[PDB]
Paper text:
Tailed double-stranded DNA (dsDNA) bacteriophages and their eukaryotic counterparts, such as herpesviruses, possess a dodecameric portal at a unique vertex of the capsid; this portal serves as a channel for DNA packaging during viral assembly and delivery. The portal interacts with multiple copies of a scaffolding protein (SP) to form a nucleation complex, which initiates the assembly of the major capsid protein (i.e., coat protein) and other minor proteins into a procapsid. The P22 procapsid consists of an icosahedral coat comprising 415 coat protein (gene product [gp] 5) subunits, a dodecameric ring comprising portal protein (gp1) subunits located at a unique capsid vertex, and an internal core comprising approximately 250–300 SP (gp8) subunits and 3 ejection proteins. In this study, we present the structure of the SP gp8 in complex with the dodecameric portal in the P22 procapsid at subnanometer resolution.
Each nodule comprised two copies of the base domain (base dimer) interacting with each other. We referred to the bases near the portal axis as inner base and those far from the axis as outer base. The two base domains likely interacted through electrostatic interactions. Residues Arg240, Glu243, and Arg244 of the inner base domain were located close to residues Arg240 and Glu243 of the outer base domain. Furthermore, each nodule interacted with the portal through the stacking of the inner base on a loop (residues 495–504) of the portal wing. Local reconstruction of the side nodule and stalk-like structure revealed that the side nodule comprised two copies of the base domain, whereas the stalk comprised the column domain, which connected one of the two base domains in the side nodule. The nodules, side nodules, and windmill blades were all dimers of the SP base domain. The SP dimer primarily forms through interactions between two copies of the same α-helix (residues 231–245) within the base domains; this explains why a recombinant SP fragment (residues 238–303) weakly self-associates into dimers.
Numbering used by the authors:
A (entry chain A): 72 to 85, 139 to 248
B (entry chain B): 69 to 88, 144 to 252
The structure:
Amino acid sequence: RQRELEQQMEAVKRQDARSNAVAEQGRKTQEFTQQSAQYVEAARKHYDAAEKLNIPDYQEKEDAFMQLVPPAVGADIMRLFPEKSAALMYHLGANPEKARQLLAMDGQSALIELTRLSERLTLK
Amino acid sequence: ERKRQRELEQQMEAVKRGELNAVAEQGRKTQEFTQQSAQYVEAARKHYDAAEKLNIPDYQEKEDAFMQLVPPAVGADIMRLFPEKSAALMYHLGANPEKARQLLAMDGQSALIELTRLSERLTLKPRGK
């Protein structure tokens, strides 16, 4: 997953109105850059999670989550809760219904619930 | 607050009263608006009732502060996306205009967090014996 993120990074690696637009473009490029960076750091933490974990079931739980969700979004999610992303992934994977439940209903709230999810969780 | 429950309810009720291919556009708009309004009412009463349940003396007061602070819809949406939690958080809203401003400044995904984090932070885990 990191390498896929790395490819996005690799992409980065490789008159008044115009001033407003060129400026807007600079801002946009920078934004993309930062998000992607968020994505590698997210990857860094995701793999911080993955390396500290050595769990392919957690990886499998994610796989269930992955079929369910677009990865970049999950990565943004990883960005949101770097500390518990792995944990978060595990719950959802364990809870196949819950993640879709998040999708079907109030995704905005669902992410909000994600912290809670990222919460009541009593770890191991 | 009970009086102010009406203020929010009234604007909505008035629209609820209805003195507002093309017809398909119409149906979509109307129904959606109506659903949103019903939600707002669940919320309006809730915003007000829960606030009453708190009864902290400045609810409505602060409401103004927050309302002025932010586009009303944001908060309203927040109410939608928050139970009593909401109004209490509205309370907090007034509780922190600059902080709130920071909360506002933060991007939309971040915004969730703002609300998010605040909510539990802002609630009542009970106690034992």
